[PDB]
Amino acid sequence: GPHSMRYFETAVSRPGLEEPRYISVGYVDNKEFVRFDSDAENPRYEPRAPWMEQEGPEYWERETQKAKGQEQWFRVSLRNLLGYYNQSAGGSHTLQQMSGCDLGSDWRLLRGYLQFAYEGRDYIALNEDLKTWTAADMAAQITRRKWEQSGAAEHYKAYLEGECVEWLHRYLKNGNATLLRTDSPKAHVTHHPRSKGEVTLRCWALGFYPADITLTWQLNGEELTQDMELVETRPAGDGTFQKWASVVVPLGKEQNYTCRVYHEGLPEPLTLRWEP
């Protein structure tokens, strides 16, 4: 399938003679691979995947150095934002950034991303064409005007099209199969008697990876996406994930109902009925 790299950056300002906390997290194929936190003992970029040991100290020098600069950038930006929004000293404020790469399975660039959020709301984003900006708020306009003035998009476009892609290419061969992992789900349904002639059928999927998955309940080929319950997919803590989905039906007629589970690492969907 396709591949991706992202860096998720955050700066959080809190009231004081304090400095904002700057946190930067790297991801290759959605899996955290490097990380830098400004509240660290010894502020630096640490590996988070074993295959990143391969990189020598020179890499870590550059990247953490690169981090300290971003840290400044966020600090200044954070102050400007306070102006732009007419917010008065003593606030808790947050500034976020996602940027990176998508590759198809030909390792050919598919799309670059660059977007910012203030207070957890879209603030400005590079458009797919990688030369125009979308700005949400009125306050974002002045950034846009300014960045259109300085031709910022050309700076990012160079990065998104060049380095981001190459380094991802580099990480991909060092990560290799490691991040090709799938663990398929295991599924069962638990049978829960209700009042009123009912039973709650709960369809479980456990120990799967990646997190993406879909579970559905079917009455007679028809798909009851209709008043079933889901939970947000959850981490087990061990690298795998879990989810469940329930329907309420008349017990005795449990063969009528069927759960299906869809996941990359399945040769094909799982079909399962409650087993007496």
């Binding site: 990247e63 930006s77 934002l81 300014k146 990065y159 380095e163 380094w167």
Partner: peptide, 9 residues
Amino acid sequence: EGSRNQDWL
């Protein structure tokens, strides 16, 4: 590898 932002916001 991380990017270097250009002009501030």
